[PDB]
Paper text:
The COMMD-ring forms the highly interconnected core of the complex. NTDs of several COMMDs (2, 3, 4, 5, 7 and 10) bind a segment of the CCDCs via this interface, which we call the peptide-binding site. CCDC93 proceeds to circle around the NTD of COMMD2 in a headlock, binding the peptide-binding site via α9 and forming a long helix-loop-helix motif (HLH) (α10 and α11) that reaches all the way around to the NN–CH domain. The final helices (α12 and α13) predominantly bind the COMMD domain of COMMD7, with α12 binding in a tight hydrophobic pocket, before reaching the I-coil region. CCDC22 occupies the lower half of the COMMD-ring. Finally, α14 of CCDC22 binds COMMD domains of COMMD1, COMMD6 and COMMD8 in a similar topology to α8, before reaching the peptide-binding sites on COMMD7 and COMMD10, and meeting CCDC93 at the I-coil region. Supporting our assignment, one XL–MS crosslink was identified between Lys318 of CCDC93 and Lys114 of COMMD7. The flexibility of the NTDs correlates with the occupancy of this binding site as empty sites on COMMD1 and COMMD9 are the most flexible, followed closely by COMMD7 and COMMD10, each binding a short helix between long flexible regions of CCDC22.
Residue numbers in the entry:
A (entry chain E): 23 to 224
B (entry chain K): 59 to 208, 248 to 297
C (entry chain J): 69 to 202
D (entry chain F): 16 to 85
E (entry chain A): 65 to 190
F (entry chain L): 120 to 219, 241 to 264, 291 to 302
G (entry chain B), H (entry chain D): 1 to 199
I (entry chain H): 62 to 183
Write the structure that this text describes.
């Protein structure tokens, strides 16, 4: 099962609560789960839904926790690996009512999915990225130590997505090492991609 | 445990015994008998014979698995020993560990020194015409050929034909900076020299 | 200490001017230095001075230098939000020397394949700007 | 450079401490409030012994004498 | 206690007049030691008990202002004062202040009020 | 002990009730779950000094206290958490004060004065080389 | 695959056949000693006078030999590919066999040193935990508030850092669930193929 | 299978593995090695020279030694953590396959140091902070520019706080009005009354 | 208001400073002094304590029972957490200090010695 | 629970039938709770037209006494038996004892939620995320071929200056160690429920 | 206590292929009690001449008074 | 600067949707100047004015930012060079209009870009006072002239973070120190009175 070898306790709890729940309330809750996955703050809207449904907060918490887990584990699977027929079968082993299964399936496979995939791909980053890169190229004509220098250098400034920024000067012997290193890594990324496509894809 | 240790290119999904009853043990016995021929196990075994557990007949099956498992650990390394050592290093340190931590920095310095002595340095410069831009791969290959880091031979040779040799490591100018000094600043230099004459 | 400072000042002036050997000989005698000391300067300057002048030329007047480049290549396999990945990742480490503080700062940057090619294209612009000077 | 915005003082006795039952020594404590460039205002406080105050006060009387005859 | 000679010798004498007590000669050595060290020890206890900043030094100069970039002619004098402060066992800070002839006299009268406060308190017992 | 047995039994049944509820994503937590799972904000204890009417007040001080110029004591603080902290520390000081030698006190103040009198009564590179060689 | 010896690197190594193999064995000893501990230039002028060559001749030969061992260990080049790399140099079988043994004797130790150079990410060191129940506060006198106090110890650049943190019970059950799923991934058929095929 | 010294859990696989390395020593030197590790747990240092000197009996390599010290430290600490007696420990180490003579020896050393172990393990248990000391000075204020006569006491406190053993204490220094001081002392006495009801 | 209270001026000297104001403004100010004199004087005393490098602004405390740890399963150790807010350089800095039963006893025993001196002056 | 002489005298005046009738007692008592719990600092909270005959020095003194006792009773978790004992000590009659308990019971939960919101705490972990990578190469070392985990904890507290995420890396052995520690901690919560 | 300087031309930038801007960089070393600080300042071509013109006025008024 | 793409040119077709030529002109001018954060603000401005989708507005601001800076970086001096950048299928009246706008601003763009280069911190203002020192705590009388030099200095605010972008430093000079640096700075002046160095 896409839920792993042993059913998470929050999913088992939620699946027995669904028998008592009006489909109108289920579909209202499901929107909050999906929009929370896209990063939207929903806390006040959930509270209003609670008193509207007369759900105590102990049951809201169990329902919301169980729905989040089910969608998280399904949406992390590529379309090669979970497909509508096997998803629908596996959810029926949880004894989820068939009408609610259709609503869940529409979230995992319908037109909501591409925006969810975009948000899920953002979470692979762990180190910061280059946000900006600026330079100037200078030639030194004279200096305190030399009447004539005539030596080039590159002044560089990086801004990272961390919000950190660095300004530093690069000797041309050091720029050659940087340029070499970057082209080398690009060759070795391309070689690794060809290993993967010819051995891991089959 | 021997099966999963081998990793012999099969989608081996199966469950350990867990002191399970009849039922689970039967399903596992079918799976083991299914996996063995895909591993090219020379010795046959049967699911009923697993339940009766004919040690005399299961012994050669185990001999295959144990021999293959040992070989695989000898190349991949013993994980459980590495865990035991990691539990030591978390709170203890042998005299040879303290020694290594002491001399670590001076050792590291020697290899970054050698890396600078023998760094790749730019031997060639490519022409600005006949744009190589047509794909990323031939641009990146052309860049590495500038450092000598070479139809594979024909690809190199057609790329190498777009290049000129070099002999200098730092780009120091032959006083040609006057051309860019005068050609763009000199009017401003004339204004400033005139005004700071007139002001005094 | 005064003598060492005096010798340093003599050699510092020789670097700044980039004095030719015969001119250096005359200037030493002009301060009434004895012939053997003046000749000793000229010999020592002749071989070693040209390397020293180059070593001065590479000096930087800035609070920070780039000092070290280093990289690691990784393959992403999974994360908590997606399974079954096969993505090359590069981590670049730039070691920046802050000579005001005599301290080296290590800057770590992630790149995807498209991001590293974009960075490469900027370095290729810098090199063409540098190549325009020669 | 910096400019004084305000000057305040207090006179007190240090009576007792955990290490010394009878300290019983007087001090003068001064608070200086200074304005920085762009008018940023900050405070600094320091204690003086009574001999230190007498010297501090004595030297400001020298400043006032030279500043007239400058 | 910061003992005076009567307190010191009475306390030490009681220490002599007990089982295993010190000798009178040992007490005499202690008293000679304590005479010189009493000054140094007391001041050390003051420093140990202080964890506000203290005045480490005062320095000053007086200048004649003469010309600036824009003001072609100036003559009014100015006093520049450097104040050195630090906490016990820590590096000194330096605070530098600049005063005209008027603010010099405003501060000077403020210090005269400190002295007249002290003089009152010690005269009140009269 | 019976009293500590009652405490530990109360502790254990609280942990059950907390383990029995799943973790909920922070963007979905209603205020009850914000408290249990730590995404609510606590507010620091901050006390402000109050003015209180005094029954024994007479004359012009009473004429102030009898008027709208003296606000009702808890309403003198805008925020309820600071309002609570202010009343708590005000009442705490009253207990310290009311729960707490004249010759001994006068003697000490005279001892301090003598120390003040006794204390006062002491009044009773190529650049630097070029400078050094050619511009100094 | 093979080593691409640069022409200057070849020219430095050309000193090796100029002297007895017993001296090359001494160069091998001092080469790996420098990798182990750090370089000491004072020996180069000694060997220079003993061999009647310049100190730079000794330095270039020895520092070239260290780089041969370092690059071989970095690549983990096979014994067969090593020989095919070295036979571009002309010297005789005795020296070729000496160099091959000197490589295989030391590649595993050198690779341990070379692993210290990688980009320096922060990493886990240790974790401590304590189960606390809060029973009273200045403002409210009877409570039960259970929490797990956590102290997380980390390494970076060889410097230890520590962070003191808190969880409630239900969050701690979430933390274990997620990081158990992390460990489960290395057992999935996808990651098994990577380990099996990317080698 | 579950074991008391494991905390009512099945035995870790690295522990069950390295229990077979203990059987490789003589019973007489397994007992001597326990004494060295147990001394370290009691804070009395560790003698790596002796550990290596005796384990030469079994011709251990340094990976054996590391794994042996690690497993002895785990067994002894975890039995003491859960207050397991040597009678239980001996029986349940034998279930894991440790020879009966080796089991014996190992538990007659635990039996001797069980009580001082638990006192040390309580001292080592997780702390966020420790109050190392207190200093105070009381001042009397006479007059000010801001108030012509004051005549009020004031208190200064300095608190020495230690974040980790073997580190200098941080001073927290502050000044207080006599009203603030009175309320602080009264509040600390109320906290202490509650503390004394718990233990 | 700060100046006239700090100097303990007589009412006649205050009237003489108010001679220029409207009679109702004169009378208003004299009434504000009489009704608020004692409250202002306490504010000044609080400001004299601020002639120091750091001041305790506020505190809070929590009592907790530690039930177990990774080191020992039957830990049952009472602990006090004391939170201090210390104003320094115009900013308020949070500090926390954790104490056992014995550390808290040493703290209280020390503050009781200080309180004995305070009460000889107070 | 101790109460200063100032608070006790305020209650002794609320106990009078002369100073306060049963109507004014109810209105002042309600104003006491309101001024504690309302976020509006309603300066007119005492301006009820039925309170206007009471001396404004006495009125504002008894209002602060009531509010101070409410906070002290709340903090000490006072039961009705404790409340009724102290009120009868102050000579309250059976009607006013009932009135005070009725208002206190209505507000008890709001008061206890307020008193419990005051404090500071450690940074609270709220979530975790992980990445699995296979390590290929370094510019100094080929054939590394080892997995690493990249872990981030999300913390959510502002009681002291902090940064919201803690990131660190684990090997297979380091992550297996970490998970074992958290499950050891979780097993101790389970034991504590057996108390 | 010390001054260092670098006189140069900006030939190219990330925003413009060709630039041609003259600049002066100064490093000022400033004693600040027990310690020293480095102050880095870049001047344009017009700023350099304005700076040099002012500091020559300074010299002149330092050589005459009253 | 990287070249443009058909996707960017399709975003420029959104200018056909735009309400007026000056709205195009405004978007061209601001997209050159705008930072990334400014582009978020300008994106709201673009959506409000155009009422096109946020995707069209964002791609349009990206296309103009890329197009304008590409011309400014190369310094294309003629319409013919600019027009070559556009594809042949583009809306010719819009393409001609853009060329007109680009010609006017390009002179201003190189001037604005040249000011905002990266650098060390820039000198903003210079002030000086000469005093004669007359007495001190340690010498009864003196007659030593001194210069106090006051400099106001600005750093790129992205590098400052918490600190203010501009600061002041005083520096005191004796004439001995002053004379030393007047020589140093005079060298550079001599070598520009004739328009190239010695």
């Amino acid at each position: 099962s896409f839920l792993g070898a042993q059913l998470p306790p929050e999913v088992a709890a939620m699946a027995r609560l669904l028998g008592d729940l009006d489909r109108s309330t289920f579909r209202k809750l499901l929107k909050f789960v999906v929009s929370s996955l896209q990063g939207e703050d929903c806390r006040e809207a959930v509270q209003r839904l609670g008193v509207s449904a007369n759900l105590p907060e102990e049951q809201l918490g169990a329902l919301l926790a169980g729905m989040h887990t089910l969608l998280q584990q399904a949406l992390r699977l590529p379309p090669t690996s979970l497909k509508p027929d096997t998803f629908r079968d596996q959810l029926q082993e949880l004894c989820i009512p068939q009408d609610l299964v259709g609503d869940l399936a529409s979230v995992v496979f319908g037109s909501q999915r591409p925006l969810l995939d975009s948000v899920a791909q953002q979470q692979g980053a762990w180190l910061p990225h280059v946000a900006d890169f600026r330079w100037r190229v200078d030639v030194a004509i004279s200096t305190s130590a030399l009447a004539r220098s005539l030596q080039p250098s590159v002044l560089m400034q990086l801004k990272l997505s961390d919000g950190s920024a660095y300004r530093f000067e690069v000797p041309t012997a050091k720029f050659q090492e940087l340029r070499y290193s970057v082209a080398l890594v690009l060759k070795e990324m391309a070689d690794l991609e060809k290993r993967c496509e010819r051995r891991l894809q089959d | 445990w021997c099966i999963t240790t081998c990793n012999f290119d099969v989608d081996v999904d199966l469950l350990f015994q867990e002191n399970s009853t009849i039922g689970q043990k039967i399903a596992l016995s079918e799976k083991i008998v299914s996996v063995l021929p895909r591993m090219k196990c020379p010795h046959q075994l049967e699911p009923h014979q697993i339940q009766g557990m004919d040690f005399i007949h299961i012994f050669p099956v185990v001999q295959w698995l144990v021999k293959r498992a040992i070989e695989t650990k000898e190349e991949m390394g013993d994980y459980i020993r590495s865990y035991s050592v990691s539990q030591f290093q978390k709170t203890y340190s042998l005299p040879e560990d303290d020694d290594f931590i002491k001399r670590k920095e001076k050792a590291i310095k020697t290899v970054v020194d050698l890396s600078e002595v023998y760094k790749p340095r730019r031997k060639y410069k490519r022409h600005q015409g006949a744009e190589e831009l047509l794909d990323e791969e031939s641009r990146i290959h052309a860049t590495l050929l500038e450092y000598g880091r070479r139809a594979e031979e024909q690809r190199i040779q057609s790329l190498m034909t777009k290049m000129t040799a070099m002999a200098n490591e730092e780009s120091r100018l032959t006083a040609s900076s006057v051309g860019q000094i005068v050609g763009l600043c000199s009017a401003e230099i004339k204004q400033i020299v005139s005004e700071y004459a007139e002001k005094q | 200490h005064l003598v060492l400072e005096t010798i340093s000042f003599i050699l510092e002036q020789a670097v700044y001017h980039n004095v030719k050997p015969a001119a250096l000989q005359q200037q030493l005698e002009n301060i009434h230095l004895r012939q053997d000391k003046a000749e000793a300067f000229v010999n020592t300057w002749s071989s070693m001075g040209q390397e020293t002048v180059e070593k001065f030329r590479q000096r930087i007047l800035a609070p920070c230098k780039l000092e070290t480049v280093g990289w690691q290549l990784n393959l992403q396999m999974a994360h908590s939000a997606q399974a079954k990945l096969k993505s090359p990742q590069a981590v670049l480490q730039l070691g920046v020397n802050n000579e005001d503080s005599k301290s080296l700062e290590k800057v770590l940057v992630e790149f995807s394949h498209k991001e590293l090619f974009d960075f490469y294209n900027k370095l290729e612009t810098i090199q063409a700007q540098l190549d325009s000077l020669t | 450079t910096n400019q004084l915005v305000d000057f305040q003082w207090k006179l007190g006795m240090a009576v007792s401490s955990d290490t010394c039952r009878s300290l019983k020594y007087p001090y003068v404590a001064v608070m200086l409030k200074v304005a920085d460039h762009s008018g940023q205002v900050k405070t600094k406080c320091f204690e003086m012994t009574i001999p230190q105050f007498q010297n501090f006060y004595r030297q400001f009387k020298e400043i006032a004498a030279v500043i007239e005859t400058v | 206690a910061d003992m005076d000679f009567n307190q010191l010798e009475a306390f030490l004498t009681a220490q002599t007049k007990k089982q295993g007590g010190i000798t009178s000669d040992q007490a005499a050595v202690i008293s000679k030691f304590w005479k010189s060290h009493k000054t140094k020890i007391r001041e050390s206890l003051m420093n140990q008990s202080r964890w506000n900043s203290g005045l480490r030094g005062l320095s000053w100069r007086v200048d004649g202002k003469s010309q600036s970039r824009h003001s072609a002619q100036i003559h009014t004098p100015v006093a520049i004062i450097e104040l050195e402060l630090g906490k016990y066992g820590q590096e000194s800070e330096f605070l530098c202040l600049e005063f005209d002839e008027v603010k010099v006299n405003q501060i000077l009268k403020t210090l005269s009020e400190v002295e007249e406060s002290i003089s009152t308190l010690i005269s009140q017992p009269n | 002990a019976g009293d500590s047995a009652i405490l530990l039994r109360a502790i254990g049944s609280q942990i059950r009730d907390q383990l029995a509820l799943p973790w909920v994503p922070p963007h979905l937590r209603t205020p009850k779950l914000q408290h249990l799972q730590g995404s609510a904000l606590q507010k620091p204890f901050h006390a402000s000094r109050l003015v209180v009417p005094e029954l024994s007040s007479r004359g012009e001080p009473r004429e102030f206290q009898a008027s709208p110029l003296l606000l009702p004591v808890p309403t003198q603080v805008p925020q309820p958490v600071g309002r609570v902290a202010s009343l708590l520390e005000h009442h705490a000081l009253q207990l310290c004060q009311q729960t707490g030698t004249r010759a001994q006190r006068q003697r000490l103040q005279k001892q301090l004065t003598e120390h003040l009198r006794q204390s006062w009564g002491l009044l009773g590179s190529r650049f630097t080389h070029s400078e050094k060689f050619t511009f100094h | 695959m093979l080593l691409e010896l640069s022409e200057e690197h070849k020219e430095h190594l050309a000193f090796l056949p100029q002297v007895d193999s017993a001296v090359v064995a001494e160069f091998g000893r001092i080469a790996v000693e420098f990798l182990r501990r750090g370089a000491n230039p004072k020996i180069y002028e000694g060997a220079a006078r003993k061999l009647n060559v310049s100190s730079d001749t000794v330095q270039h030969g020895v520092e070239g030999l260290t780089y041969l061992l370092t690059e071989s260990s970095k690549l983990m080049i096979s014994e067969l590919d090593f020989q095919d790399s070295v036979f571009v140099l002309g010297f005789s079988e005795e020296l070729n066999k000496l160099l091959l043994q000197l490589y295989l004797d030391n590649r595993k130790e050198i690779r341990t040193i070379l692993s210290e150079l990688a980009p320096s990410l922060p990493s886990y060191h240790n974790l401590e935990w304590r189960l606390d129940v809060q029973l009273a506060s200045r403002s409210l006198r009877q409570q039960i508030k259970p929490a797990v106090t956590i102290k997380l110890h980390l390494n970076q650049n060889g410097d230890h850092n520590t962070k003191v943190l808190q969880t409630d019970p239900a969050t701690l059950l979430h933390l274990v669930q997620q990081l158990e799923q992390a460990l489960e991934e290395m057992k999935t058929n996808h990651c098994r193929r990577v380990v099996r095929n990317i080698k | 299978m579950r074991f008391r010294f494991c905390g009512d859990l099945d035995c870790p696989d690295w522990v069950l593995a390295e229990i077979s390395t203990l059987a490789k020593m003589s019973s007489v030197k397994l007992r001597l090695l326990c004494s060295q590790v147990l001394k370290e747990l009691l804070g009395q240092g560790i003698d790596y020279e002796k550990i290596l000197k005796l384990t030469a009996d079994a011709k251990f390599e340094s990976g054996d030694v590391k794994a042996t010290v690690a497993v002895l430290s785990f067994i002894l600490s975890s039995a003491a953590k859960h207050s397991v007696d040597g009678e239980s420990l001996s029986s349940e180490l034998q279930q894991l396959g440790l020879p009966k003579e080796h089991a014996a020896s190992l538990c007659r050393c635990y039996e001797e140091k069980q009580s001082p172990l638990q006192k040390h393990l309580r001292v080592c248990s997780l702390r966020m902070n420790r109050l190392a000391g207190v200093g105070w000075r009381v001042d009397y204020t006479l007059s000010s520019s801001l108030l012509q006569s004051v005549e009020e006491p004031m208190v200064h406190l300095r608190l020495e706080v230690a974040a980790a053993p073997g580190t200098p204490a941080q001073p927290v220094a502050m000044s207080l009005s006599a009203d603030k001081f009175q309320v602080l002392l009264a509040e600390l006495k109320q906290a202490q009354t509650l503390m004394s009801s718990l233990g | 208001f700060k100046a006239i209270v700090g100097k303990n001026l007589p009412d006649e000297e205050i009237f003489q400073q108010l001679n220029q104001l409207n009679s109702l403004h004169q009378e208003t100010i004299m009434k504000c002094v009489k009704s608020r004199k004692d409250e202002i004087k306490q504010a000044l005393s609080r400001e004299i304590v601020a002639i120091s490098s750091a001041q305790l602004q506020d505190f809070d405390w929590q009592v907790k029972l530690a039930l177990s740890s990774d080191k020992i399963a039957a830990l049952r150790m009472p602990l006090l957490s004391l939170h201090l807010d210390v104003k320094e350089n115009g900013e308020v800095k949070p500090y926390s200090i954790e104490m056992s039963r014995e550390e808290l006893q040493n703290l209280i025993q020390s503050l009781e010695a200080a309180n004995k001196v305070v009460l000889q002056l107070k | 629970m101790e109460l200063s002489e100032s608070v006790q005298k305020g209650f002794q005046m609320l106990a009078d039938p002369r100073s306060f009738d049963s109507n004014a007692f109810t209105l002042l008592l309600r104003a006491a709770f309101q001024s504690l719990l309302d976020a509006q600092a309603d300066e007119a909270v005492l301006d009820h037209p039925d309170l206007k005959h009471i001396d404004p020095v006495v009125l504002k003194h008894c209002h602060a006494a009531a509010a101070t006792y409410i906070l002290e009773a709340g903090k000490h978790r006072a039961d009705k038996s404790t409340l009724s004992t102290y009120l009868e000590d102050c000579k309250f009659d059976r009607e006013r004892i009932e009135l005070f308990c009725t208002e206190y019971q209505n507000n008890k939960n709001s008061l206890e939620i307020l008193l419990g919101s005051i404090g500071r705490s450690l940074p609270h972990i709220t979530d975790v995320s992980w990445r699995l990578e296979y390590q290929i190469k370094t510019n100094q070392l080929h054939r590394m071929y080892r997995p690493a985990y990249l872990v981030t904890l999300s913390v959510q507290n502002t009681d002291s200056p902090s940064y919201p995420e803690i990131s660190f890396s684990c090997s297979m052995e380091q992550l297996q160690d970490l998970v074992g520690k958290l499950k050891d901690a979780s097993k101790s919560l389970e034991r504590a429920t057996q108390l | 206590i010390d001054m260092e300087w670098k006189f140069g031309v900006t030939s190219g930038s990330s925003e413009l292929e060709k630039v041609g801007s003259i600049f002066l960089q100064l490093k000022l070393v400033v004693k600040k009690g027990n310690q020293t600080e480095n102050v880095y300042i870049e001047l344009t071509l017009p700023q350099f001449y304005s700076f040099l013109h002012e500091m020559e006025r300074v010299r002149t008024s330092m050589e005459c008074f009253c | 600067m990287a070249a443009l793409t058909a996707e960017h040119f399709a975003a420029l077709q959104s200018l056909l949707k735009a309400s007026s030529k000056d709205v195009v002109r405004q978007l061209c001018q601001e997209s050159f100047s705008s930072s990334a954060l400014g582009l978020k603000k300008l994106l709201d401005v673009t959506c409000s004015s155009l009422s096109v989708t946020q995707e069209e507005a964002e791609e349009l601001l990206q296309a103009l930012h890329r197009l304008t800076r590409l011309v400014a970086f190369r310094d294309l001096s003629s319409a013919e060079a600019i027009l070559a950048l556009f594809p042949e299928n583009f809306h010719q009246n819009l393409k001609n209009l853009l060329t007109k706008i680009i010609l006017e601003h390009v002179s201003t763009w190189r001037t604005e870009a040249q000011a905002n280069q990266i650098s060390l911190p820039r000198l903003v203002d210079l002030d000086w006072r000469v005093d004669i020192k007359t007495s001190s705590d340690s010498i009864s009388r003196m007659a030593v002239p001194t210069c106090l030099l006051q400099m106001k200095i600005q750093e790129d605010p992205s590098l400052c973070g918490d600190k203010p972008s501009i600061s002041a430093v005083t520096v005191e000079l004796s004439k001995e120190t002053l004379d030393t640096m007047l020589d140093g700075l005079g060298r550079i002046r001599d070598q520009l009175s004739a328009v190239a160095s010695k």
